[PDB]
Design a protein around this ligand. Structure first.
Ligand SMILES: [Fe+3]
Length: 818
């Protein structure tokens, strides 16, 4: 009596950047019973069974997928299959998608969703096992599968030692000691981030390459930063390997650009604003050997357009797509703090002046020098303004002040720590009314002006603010709060939740490609002399600055309502549907985000109850308790003592934790990531660095400012060479791969057998299509054009759920996938 099976797999060549060799005795499968056990209680194991033949007569197949027939001998003593071993006897690895068994059990068909690389059987200490798609909390695991379930978890965890190899599937933690390169040079040494109270930091995935020669504390370099093999995503099309673009940029392209500036083949500085707009019109002209080193590289070559010989042209940023000059206005400057690339730092102001929390013994009186009588508040008094909650601020003073001295000693960096005061006008748009530029150890207030040298000083003051915001966005809003903060949860999930676990299935789609991009970022983006260090103001202090901000990171404050309330931009109000009332009614990021938040909340609340009926059930899930214990105590271990960590003893706790993780991975990361090039592609709108302080009265710098304001700006912001590298970086980060999996989607529709979970997930996908319509309406509502479109006429679509491939300024991926 035979069971007919179909195996779907992808050979290696199809996923990189001969089908009959799979037949014969090359690939074996053995089924494992879920209902009949041997003496020691384990599911009985069937016989080695080999792929019989190709199956071209199957219509569901996708690109690169091939199917194979197989028939198992499975008699009455064997029971119902719930798992299977596979052994690859080929020398090459292949990517196993699924096994489908026809007509055997109560539900008839048994589906195994695998999606896993299967290397030659000699490379594995234990045989590869895969489970059917039924969901089981540990207490409901069929008894003959119990031991397998735990043994695979033990295998994923490893023993905390060893150099990790390509095919390893071992998840473990380590600190950020792999960014400095002291064996090459003592100037490339970097503090270890994590495991101390000086430099607390989230953990990253352990690689085990062992110590450098000069510093035992720092991990040595490698050509390949390991991630556990199934995190290392293959792509059908080489253009979708966006993550490897950043590696090419730093190793190949940037040294090429650097040659063209050393040989004086192009002007070393921008000289007008037109020199910058040229980048996306006539292209910049370059030596032939530089273009010939760039245009053959995959991914990199998709960024620019070229004539083959001398041109590289960048695409046109969305922000200059209607007005070339609207970025320069105070209204857009202000609007981007609520509908821009970094829309989540502005705070409400309830006392005036604002005060610093810094130690006056080290910095001085840090009471703000801004006077209430110098502000033009549209006729309001200060008391009125405060009292009707119309005053706001972008306060970077306390964050940057401890680093200004260090940064200002470097050779091509000068900055201030800035505060910006904003007033909410009766028409609902924000108005900037003052900017304070502070130094430690002059520290000036600058007021809006439209005429005279004073208006140029104001323009420059706005640039220092945005330099501040750019550093904070890249390192904090984006790198720390999404990429870095999420990796520990990824590791914990694979270590302590079985593939069988309901919460494993809920969360893992929101991890896709996360460990992989971080690994490549640790190697090329945030490493010593990497792309961030060489294009952003703080140079070698960039990453360690994120450690200072992480001291105040709070997991429960990452929930959107908690965040709006913490920042003074909303108030708790149980008469609203979302439970908060916005103090800036028309706040695009928060207003759109609250719809996404609520939809995710509904999905999570409908899913958990399918597997957990009572707080008792949560408390008694050993796998769930071990996961959460480790995530806090090891993954975010330097913050394990804090009192705000949920305890995970209640249904409500479980829903809260899952909702925060999914929020961070999908919509939060999308809102801060996918506007990077649309707004920041014009280097004058989002300068990444500043190079001098304001010119002093009676100097030729000052004279220039009066005569040529464009040159005083460009001479202040990011130089030409870093501009080219950084636009390329953010053009990559802003691009959706064609193979993205967006929110409300999943790669496989049979991820679970539970028809109830599948329907709750179908309702979620609908609710998102509905919301996307509501958001399209808002962008067309002419009452909201002041904030949603602004003078640059760029509707706020970053929180549209769906999107097509490319640089689209919309679409929420499931995960931190780039
Ligand atoms: Fe990102």
């Amino acid at each position: 009596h035979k069971i007919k099976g179909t195996v779907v797999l992808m050979p290696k060549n199809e996923l990189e950047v001969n089908l009959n060799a799979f037949l014969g005795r090359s690939v074996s499968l053995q089924l494992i019973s879920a209902t009949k056990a041997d003496a020691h209680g384990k599911g009985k194991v069937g016989k080695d069974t080999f792929l019989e033949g190709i199956n071209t007569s199957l219509p569901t197949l996708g690109a690169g997928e091939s199917a194979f027939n197989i028939h198992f001998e499975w008699d009455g003593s064997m029971g119902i299959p719930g798992a299977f071993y596979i052994k690859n006897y080929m020398q090459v690895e292949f990517f196993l998608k699924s096994l489908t068994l026809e007509a055997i059990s109560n539900q008839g068909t048994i589906r195994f969703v695998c999606n896993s690389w299967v290397y030659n059987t000699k490379l594995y200490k234990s045989v590869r096992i895969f489970f059917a798609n039924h969901t089981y909390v540990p207490s409901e695991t069929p008894a003959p599968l119990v031991e397998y379930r735990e043994e695979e978890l033990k295998s994923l965890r490893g023993n905390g030692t060893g150099e990790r190899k390509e095919y390893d599937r071992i998840y473990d933690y380590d600190v950020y000691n792999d960014l400095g390169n002291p064996d090459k040079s003592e100037k490339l040494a970097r503090p270890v981030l994590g495991g101390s109270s000086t430099f607390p930091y989230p953990r990253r995935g352990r690689t085990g390459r062992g110590p450098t020669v000069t510093d035992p504390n720092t991990e040595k370099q490698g050509e390949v930063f390991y991630v556990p093999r199934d995190e290392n995503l293959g792509h059908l099309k080489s253009k979708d390997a966006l993550e490897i673009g950043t590696k090419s940029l730093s190793q190949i392209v940037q040294p090429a650009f650097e040659s063209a500036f050393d040989l004086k083949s192009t002007p070393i500085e921008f000289h007008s604003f037109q020199d910058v707009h040229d980048l996306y019109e006539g292209g910049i002209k370059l030596p032939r050997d530089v273009i010939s080193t760039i245009i053959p590289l995959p991914v990199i070559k998709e960024l620019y357009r070229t004539d083959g010989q001398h041109i590289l042209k960048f695409p046109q940023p969305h922000v200059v797509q209607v007005s070339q000059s609207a970025w320069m206005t105070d209204e857009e400057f202000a609007r981007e703090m609520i509908a821009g690339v970094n829309p989540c730092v502005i705070r409400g102001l309830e006392e005036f002046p604002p005060k610093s929390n810094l130690d006056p013994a080290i910095y001085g009186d840090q009471s703000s020098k801004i006077t209430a009588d110098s502000l033009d508040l549209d006729g309001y008094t200060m008391d009125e303004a405060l009292g009707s909650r119309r005053l706001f601020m972008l306060d970077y003073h306390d964050i940057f002040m401890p680093y200004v001295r260090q940064i200002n000693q470097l050779n091509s960096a000068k900055t201030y720590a800035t505060r910006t005061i904003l007033f909410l006008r009766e028409d609902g748009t924000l108005k900037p009314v003052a900017i304070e530029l502070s130094l430690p150890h002059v520290s000036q207030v600058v007021l809006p002006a439209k005429e005279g040298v004073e208006s140029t000083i104001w323009l420059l003051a706005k640039a220092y603010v945005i330099v501040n915001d750019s550093c904070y966005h890249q390192l904090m809003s984006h790198w720390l709060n999404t990429h870095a903060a999420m990796e520990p949860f990824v590791i914990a999930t694979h270590r302590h939740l079985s593939v069988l676990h309901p919460i494993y299935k809920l969360l893992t789609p929101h991890y896709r490609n996360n460990m992989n991009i971080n690994a490549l970022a640790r190697q090329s983006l945030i490493n010593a002399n990497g792309a961030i260090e060489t294009t952003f103001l703080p140079s070698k202090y960039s990453v360690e600055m994120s450690s200072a901000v992480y001291k105040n990171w709070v997991f429960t404050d990452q929930a959107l309502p908690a965040d709006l309330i913490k920042r003074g931009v909303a108030i708790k109000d149980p008469s609203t549907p979302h439970g908060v009332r916005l103090l800036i009614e028309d706040y695009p990021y928060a207003a759109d985000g609250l719809e996404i938040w609520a939809a995710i909340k509904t999905w999570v609340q409908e899913y958990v109850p399918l597997y957990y009926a009572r707080d008792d059930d949560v408390k008694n899930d050993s796998e769930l308790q071990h996961w959460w214990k480790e995530a806090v105590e090891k993954g975010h271990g330097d913050l394990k003592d804090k009192p705000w960590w949920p305890k995970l003893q209640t249904l409500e706790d479980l829903v809260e934790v899952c909702l925060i993780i999914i929020w961070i991975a999908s919509a939060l990361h999308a809102a801060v990531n996918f506007g990077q090039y649309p707004y920041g592609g014009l280097i004058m709108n989002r300068p990444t660095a500043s190079r001098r302080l304001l010119p002093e009265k009676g100097t030729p710098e000052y004279e220039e400012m009066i005569n040529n304001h464009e040159k005083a700006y460009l001479r202040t912001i990011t130089s030409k060479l870093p501009t080219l590298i950084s636009l390329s970086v953010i053009e990559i980060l802003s691009t959706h791969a064609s193979d993205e999996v967006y929110l409300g989607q999943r790669d496989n529709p049979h991820w679970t057998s539970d028809s109830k979970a599948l329907q709750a997930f179908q309702k979620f996908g609908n609710k998102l299509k509905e919301i996307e319509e509501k958001l399209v309406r808002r962008n067309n509502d002419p009452s909201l054009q002041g904030n949603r479109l602004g003078p640059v006429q760029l509707p706020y679509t970053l929180l549209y759920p769906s999107s097509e491939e490319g640089l689209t300024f919309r679409g929420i991926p499931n995960s931190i996938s780039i």
